[PDB]
Design a protein around this ligand. Structure first.
Ligand SMILES: CN(CCOc1ccc(C[C@H](Nc2ccccc2C(=O)c2ccccc2)C(=O)O)cc1)c1ccccn1
Ligand code: NA
Ligand code: NA
Ligand code: NA
Length: 276
């Protein structure tokens, strides 16, 4: 390893992605970790750990008009469902904005840009969800609230099955101890996946991702001394991300069967429309 024009170009690419990452995502992992570990921040999230604390902290969740005469277990799960829906729609906007700053991305054919984002957003959502998670729960509303793992698991069937796979993923993923500069390149690697179904021009996508993989490999070398095979371990996580997406779609399908009075936002519809 030597510091030559090629390595300096990979370091500049990493910095450009970090900067775009910082301006596209308001709550970074560094900020979330400070909150979660009790460092001094401008945030003190209200903790939601049961139904009583959920109602007393209704402001943190964005939900529609409460349907009266509903069993309270059902009304609570609908509030959480609509709250995650709002955040997901918001998260997709942040991701598509960040993708534009990936060098070469907007120059790809627009059909392939849509395809890459269609298949990548949820993998990235779950990657960055881990940044806001510890073994106790997840930060919500940009750090204004904290919803516990066990409360999310206690929701009425089948709502209590949605978050658990993300927490299982997150505790293992967070043991890699990646930071925002690592994550900015990693999510770009996810977006530039040449194996998405229906891509027109695969070679330019693979060429960009090859450049991103070089940058990510160098980033982990410089940022994680004595961390053995972190590059390979991180790339293997992408397989876990895809299983989570698949498992999640099948959970959404049982609600489309089980419950009316709970349609999905048209954007999430547009994304899941013919997903695999
Ligand atoms: C847990 N959480 C943080 C955000 O977590 C996300 C968890 C998942 C997602 C992906 C997103 N998921 C949903 C989309 C629509 C409706 C429900 C969900 C749920 O996933 C869900 C379903 C049932 C019960 C609980 C959740 C997607 O498919 O697009 C995006 C964000 C909350 C919770 C309440 C309010 C806001 N923040
Ligand atoms: Na799998
Ligand atoms: Na898989
Ligand atoms: Na669907």
């Amino acid at each position: 390893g030597q510091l030559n024009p090629e390595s300096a170009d990979l370091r500049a690419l990493a910095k450009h992605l970090y900067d775009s990452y910082i301006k596209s995502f308001p709550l970074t992992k560094a900020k979330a970790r400070a909150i979660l570990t009790g460092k001094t921040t401008d945030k003190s999230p209200f903790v939601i750990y049961d139904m009583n604390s959920l109602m007393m902290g209704e402001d943190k969740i964005k939900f529609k008009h409460i349907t009266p005469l509903q069993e309270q277990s059902k009304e609570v799960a609908i509030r959480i469902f609509q709250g995650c829906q709002f955040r997901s729609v918001e998260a997709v906007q942040e991701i598509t904005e960040y993708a534009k700053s990936i060098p070469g991305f907007v120059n790809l054919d627009l059909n392939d840009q849509v395809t890459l984002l269609k298949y990548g957003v949820h993998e990235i959502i779950y990657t960055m969800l881990a940044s806001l998670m510890n073994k106790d729960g997840v930060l919500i509303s940009e750090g204004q609230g904290f919803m516990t793992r066990e409360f999310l698991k206690s929701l009425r069937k089948p709502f209590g099955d949605f978050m658990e796979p993300k927490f299982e993923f997150a505790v293992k993923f967070n043991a890699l101890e990646l930071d925002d500069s690592d994550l900015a390149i990693f999510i770009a690697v996810i977006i530039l996946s040449g194996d998405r179904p229906g891509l027109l021009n695969v070679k330019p996508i693979e060429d960009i991702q090859d450049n991103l993989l070089q940058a990510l490999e160098l980033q982990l070398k410089l940022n994680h001394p004595e961390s053995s095979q972190l590059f390979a371990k991180l790339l293997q996580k992408m397989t876990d991300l895809r299983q989570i997406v698949t498992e999640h779609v099948q959970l959404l399908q049982v609600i489309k069967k089980t419950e009316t009075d709970m349609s999905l936002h048209p954007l999430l519809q547009e994304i899941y429309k013919d997903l695999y």
